[PDB]
Amino acid sequence: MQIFVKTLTGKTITLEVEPSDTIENVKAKIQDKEGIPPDQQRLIFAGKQLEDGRTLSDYNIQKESTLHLVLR
């Protein structure tokens, strides 16, 4: 499924993900596409910071959702 990742002021990217992808899998995909190390990424959706160890399905993240990326 397609989702989007966007910083407040930065580029939008699309990712190809599955509901079973973990948050750390998504951070690795962002690193592959944008070069941002996972430790510098915070992902937020629907008011919640997404925690390592959980899946997209755990957070009810559906196709075409936008995850908000906050960088250090």
Which residues are near other proteins by CB under 8 A?
Answer: 8-9, 44, 46-49, 60, 62, 65-66, 68, 70
Q: Closer CB to other proteins, residue 32 or residue 66?
A: 66
Q: Closer CB to other proteins, residue 32 or residue 38?
A: 38
Q: Closer CB to other proteins, residue 19 or residue 68?
A: 68
d(CA 35, CA 33): 6
Contact criterion met (CB below 8 Å) for 23 and 67: no
Question: Cα angle at 31 between 28 and 33, to 5 degrees?
Answer: 115
For residue 28, give the 3-state DSSP assignment. Answer: helix
The nearest distance, CB 44 to other proteins, in angstroms, is 5
